[PDB]
Amino acid sequence: MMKFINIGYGNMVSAARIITIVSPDSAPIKRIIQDAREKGKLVDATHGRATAAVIITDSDHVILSSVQPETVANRLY
Amino acid sequence: MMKFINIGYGNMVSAARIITIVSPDSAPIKRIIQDAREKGKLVDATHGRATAAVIITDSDHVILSSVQPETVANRLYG
Amino acid sequence: MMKFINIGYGNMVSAARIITIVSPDSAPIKRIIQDAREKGKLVDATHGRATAAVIITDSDHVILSSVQPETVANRLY
Amino acid sequence: MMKFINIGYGNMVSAARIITIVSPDSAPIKRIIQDAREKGKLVDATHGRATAAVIITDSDHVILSSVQPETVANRLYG
Amino acid sequence: MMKFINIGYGNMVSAARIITIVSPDSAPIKRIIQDAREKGKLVDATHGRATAAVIITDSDHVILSSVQPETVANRLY
Amino acid sequence: MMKFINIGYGNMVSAARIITIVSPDSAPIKRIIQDAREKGKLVDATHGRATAAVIITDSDHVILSSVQPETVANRLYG
Amino acid sequence: MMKFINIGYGNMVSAARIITIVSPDSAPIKRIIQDAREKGKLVDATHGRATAAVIITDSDHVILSSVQPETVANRLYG
Amino acid sequence: MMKFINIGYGNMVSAARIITIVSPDSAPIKRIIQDAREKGKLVDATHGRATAAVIITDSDHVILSSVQPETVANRLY
Amino acid sequence: MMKFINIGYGNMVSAARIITIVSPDSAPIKRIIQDAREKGKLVDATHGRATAAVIITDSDHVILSSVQPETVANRLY
Amino acid sequence: MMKFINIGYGNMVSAARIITIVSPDSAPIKRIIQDAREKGKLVDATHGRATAAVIITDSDHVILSSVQPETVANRLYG
Amino acid sequence: MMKFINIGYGNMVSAARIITIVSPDSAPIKRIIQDAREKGKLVDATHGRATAAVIITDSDHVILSSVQPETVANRLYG
Amino acid sequence: MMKFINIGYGNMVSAARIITIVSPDSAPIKRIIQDAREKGKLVDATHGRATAAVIITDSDHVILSSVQPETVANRLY
Amino acid sequence: MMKFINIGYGNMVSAARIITIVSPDSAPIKRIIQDAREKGKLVDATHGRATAAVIITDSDHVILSSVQPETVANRLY
Amino acid sequence: MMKFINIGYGNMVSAARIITIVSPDSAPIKRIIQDAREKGKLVDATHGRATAAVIITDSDHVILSSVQPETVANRLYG
Amino acid sequence: MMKFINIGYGNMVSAARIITIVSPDSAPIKRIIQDAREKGKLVDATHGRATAAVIITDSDHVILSSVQPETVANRLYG
Amino acid sequence: MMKFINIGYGNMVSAARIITIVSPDSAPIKRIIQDAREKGKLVDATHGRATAAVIITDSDHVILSSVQPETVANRLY
């Protein structure tokens, strides 16, 4: 079981710091992304690809990934 | 016992970060949802379907799920 | 030993987040309930039944349950 | 070693959240009780009987119990 | 090894919450006691006896005990 | 599984304090670097070479490394 | 490995709460001592003897000890 | 594996409190040192020798050591 | 020119403390009223009549009046 | 136009510090009184008689008076 | 020179509390409106008509008016 | 009209800084006095005489005077 | 002497709320503009024209004007 | 009526910044002096002589003077 | 007596907002300039020329001017 | 009566912003100077001469002057 999860293109997130991993396709999460962009809490790890998952961490950073949310979780192993 | 729980339509929550999982069936939890919406702490994981469970996390985010609360809790085990 | 406790009618609370579980029948806890209602920290999980237990969590949420307080604690197992 | 301790009349406290359990027998702890009453941090679990122990928790709540302090501590074990 | 330590006359302190246990016989700790008295963080558990130890907890409460400081620590066992 | 990870040129980071390790390849992470520079939270461990990984720690420090992000993560194991 | 360390003359410190143990031999640590004195965070456990070690705890208290820093650390083990 | 690490000349740091150990030879870490000096968070444990490592702790103290950074980490054992 | 303005049924407001006087008939001001009710900043001076004006003061209190907003302002004289 | 207004039984308030003077006749102002009582911001100048006016000051103190609100305001002039 | 300015449909603003009066014609002021809406600082005095002026007050409230900005300012004088 | 008011025995208060001057004979003002004593905001200018007036200032200091409250106000002239 | 100053195209600023009016042509003021944009404190009143003056107000809003800075000040009259 | 008042030995205070001028003759004002000393808000203008007046300013600084309180106040006028 | 002062090259400052106008000729004011630069409170009105005066305003902004401090002050009068 | 006071060598202070002007020759004011130095609130306007007056302003800046304190005040005129 991994401490660090590959969220695509070599970018890594600590599993123990994740609160939730969700789809980017509704208004509340879009509000969270724009808030993070304004506050300097946004990290874009999609490396030019479509955003498929939004990772919210306990430091209240918001990380964009090109990977399916369930796949990010699956990569714990 | 799992680290991440599928709360419907591929959306995942860390089990250790959950405080409570309740029905959306009364005024106080509805106040909590609207507060979270205003503050940018709301996450809607229902994928357009009826809200069946409201998840409050220790980061004081509020997550809407389309599955019953007991279903979220039962999925702690594989 | 459970991580999540059924506090009645399918509603769940994380055991590790509970500070105290008390009866609702005196002035100080009633002050705590009304404070939580005003602050948006109250959760009513009694599902139309009489409040039998008041659960205070470490996030300072206040959760109303229809179950006896000792029974909520017993459900840890 | 128990997670929840019965402090009398069915009222329960999480053992890991307790900082100290003391007698109500002097001015400083009485100051702490009145401060908690004013701030909405006081919990009275005495069920109308004499206060015998004062429990201070890490959330800086103050809980009144009708059982002796050593009795609260001893109940940590079944 | 105990979770709760008897600090005299039945009064109990959680061992994991203690930062330091010191003698009350110098100016800096006396400043700490008076600050706690003013702030409502002082607890007097000496039950009418001479203060022999001052316990500082992580919640920044200050607890007076009639017991030798090394004896309080010894009571962990 | 190691406590400290060498991120290049002798510089060390505590593994348990890392939140994320990402490429410096877009505007949001560059915003994070400049914010840290202004606030005195930036640490440059590149030893004059090209930045290949950006480490964000739970203390909300930002650490620049000359090694690829996957290399930082792989070094968790000896 | 002990929970409490005797730092001289019966005074005790929780090992898990210590951040650093250093000599009082330079201006920065002396600044830290004077700041703690002003703020009411200083604890003098030297019992009237020369300060040999300065203990900084996670509660940002500052504790003066009459024993060498290596002696405080060595006493972690019985 | 040690709880306390000797960072030179008898000075000790708790390993679990360290965030990062870096060289002092660039502008950002020098900003961190000067900030700590102004704020009263700086600790100089070099005991008159050249600074070889800068230790940042979770309490946001900054500790100067005369030892190589990798050597400080090696001393965990 | 008055220091105190009669806002109906003998209730008085200091003119110099008023920021704005508006109609209660749209969503944003209704949000302001409900926020004030929750926070303990609401004052209801309508004395059982329909709310015709909402007074926002510099202390961020919200005062309900039964009088037309322009009439409240006119009463400055 | 006076600086100090007699609000009954010798008690005085600075006119320039008053925000509003209202009847105690509804739930919101009663919430304000109880909040002030809990916080130590309440001043009772009624001298044991029925409360007829509630004065809120810019320091967010709450003062109870036994005279009608219009009487407080009229006394601004001698 | 008036204390209160009619900003349309009977709605009034204290002139001394106004910081700026601008057109709603660009992204930054629209950001300010949406921020105020989320925070409960927005006041809509347009009475259902097109927004022509945005008033920012020193209490950091944001007030929407249906009259041109120059009209608000000109009404300072009777 | 004075800037400074003699509140007895040579002690002076700036008139423009006073919020209210009240009798000390009820529970709420006694709470205010004890709060100020604990917080280091209390000033006792009675010079050994009975407290007749309690002065609350905008800095939230609380000043005890031996003079009738209406007399303190009268001394503005 | 005006209370409100026309800063171009009908946009108005209260003169008493202005701290400084400066040219936009150097790095520090550009930092101030970008900070305000991120924080939601920026107001763009240039109405599609080149920015000629940057107005900093006491509420720490930043207002862009198409008018020369000295001309904005001149319009006080 | 003067802007600056000489409080002895050339030391000056702005009259408009003074809240109260009192004797140092009781425990509460002594608490205020010691608090100011600890916080770095104390100013000693006595030039080595007995403290006769204690000046509290709106910046919550505390200034010690060697002249009687009535003398400070009387010097408001030339 | 003017409301706005020209501090060189068309840049204007409100006279009532100025706390102090000093030479850039020592370490403490240079510390103030660098702090303002880091925090986004610095304004450079020198138009590329040597700094001759440093203006600190009540909003704790720091403004660099190319004119001597006495020149800024003298321009208060027309 | 001046708005700005010359405090020596062309350096200017706004009279309305001054709280107190005192001699630098005792421990409490020296604590205030060192605090200001650490916090970045110190301004040294002595231009290489002996400090004769310490000016404390309402923004809690501390300004060193080479002029007698009573002379600074006299320069109001």
CSV table of N, CA and C in Angstrom, one decimal, chain M residues 1-3 6-9 15-16 20 28-31 35-36 42 45 47 49 51 54 57-58 67:
chain,number,residue,atom,x,y,z
M,1,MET,N,-14.9,72.5,-3.9
M,1,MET,CA,-14.1,71.3,-3.8
M,1,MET,C,-15.0,70.1,-3.7
M,2,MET,N,-14.7,69.1,-4.5
M,2,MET,CA,-15.7,68.0,-4.7
M,2,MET,C,-15.5,66.9,-3.6
M,3,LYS,N,-16.6,66.2,-3.2
M,3,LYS,CA,-16.5,65.0,-2.5
M,3,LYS,C,-16.2,63.8,-3.5
M,6,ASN,N,-14.6,62.5,-10.8
M,6,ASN,CA,-14.8,61.7,-12.0
M,6,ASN,C,-13.4,61.2,-12.5
M,7,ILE,N,-13.3,59.9,-12.5
M,7,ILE,CA,-12.0,59.3,-12.9
M,7,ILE,C,-12.1,58.7,-14.3
M,8,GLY,N,-13.0,59.3,-15.1
M,8,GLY,CA,-13.2,58.9,-16.5
M,8,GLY,C,-14.4,58.1,-16.8
M,9,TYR,N,-15.1,58.5,-17.9
M,9,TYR,CA,-16.3,57.7,-18.4
M,9,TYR,C,-17.4,57.6,-17.3
M,15,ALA,N,-13.0,61.4,-2.9
M,15,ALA,CA,-11.7,62.0,-2.7
M,15,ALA,C,-11.1,61.7,-1.3
M,16,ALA,N,-11.9,61.7,-0.3
M,16,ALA,CA,-11.4,61.5,1.1
M,16,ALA,C,-11.0,60.0,1.3
M,20,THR,N,-3.2,57.3,-2.5
M,20,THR,CA,-2.2,57.7,-3.5
M,20,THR,C,-2.8,57.4,-4.9
M,28,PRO,N,6.6,47.5,-8.4
M,28,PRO,CA,5.8,47.4,-7.2
M,28,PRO,C,4.3,47.7,-7.4
M,29,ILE,N,3.9,48.7,-8.2
M,29,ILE,CA,2.5,48.9,-8.4
M,29,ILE,C,1.9,47.8,-9.2
M,30,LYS,N,2.6,47.2,-10.1
M,30,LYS,CA,2.1,46.0,-10.8
M,30,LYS,C,1.8,44.8,-9.9
M,31,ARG,N,2.7,44.6,-8.9
M,31,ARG,CA,2.4,43.7,-7.8
M,31,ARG,C,1.1,44.0,-7.1
M,35,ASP,N,-2.1,41.6,-7.0
M,35,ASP,CA,-2.6,41.2,-5.7
M,35,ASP,C,-4.1,41.5,-5.6
M,36,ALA,N,-4.5,42.7,-6.0
M,36,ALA,CA,-5.9,43.1,-5.9
M,36,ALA,C,-6.8,42.3,-6.8
M,42,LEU,N,-9.7,44.6,-7.0
M,42,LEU,CA,-9.5,45.4,-8.2
M,42,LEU,C,-10.8,45.9,-8.8
M,45,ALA,N,-11.8,50.8,-14.2
M,45,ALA,CA,-12.7,51.9,-14.7
M,45,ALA,C,-12.1,52.6,-15.9
M,47,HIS,N,-12.5,51.5,-19.0
M,47,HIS,CA,-13.6,51.4,-20.0
M,47,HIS,C,-13.0,51.2,-21.4
M,49,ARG,N,-9.7,51.6,-22.3
M,49,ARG,CA,-8.5,52.5,-22.6
M,49,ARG,C,-7.3,52.1,-21.8
M,51,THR,N,-4.5,52.1,-19.2
M,51,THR,CA,-4.4,52.6,-17.8
M,51,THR,C,-3.3,53.7,-17.7
M,54,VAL,N,-3.3,54.6,-11.2
M,54,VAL,CA,-3.7,53.6,-10.3
M,54,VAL,C,-4.0,54.3,-9.0
M,57,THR,N,-7.1,53.1,-2.4
M,57,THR,CA,-8.1,53.6,-1.4
M,57,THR,C,-7.8,53.0,-0.1
M,58,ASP,N,-8.4,53.7,1.0
M,58,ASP,CA,-8.2,53.3,2.3
M,58,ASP,C,-8.8,51.9,2.7
M,67,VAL,N,-7.1,58.2,-16.8
M,67,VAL,CA,-6.7,59.6,-16.7
M,67,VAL,C,-5.4,59.8,-16.0
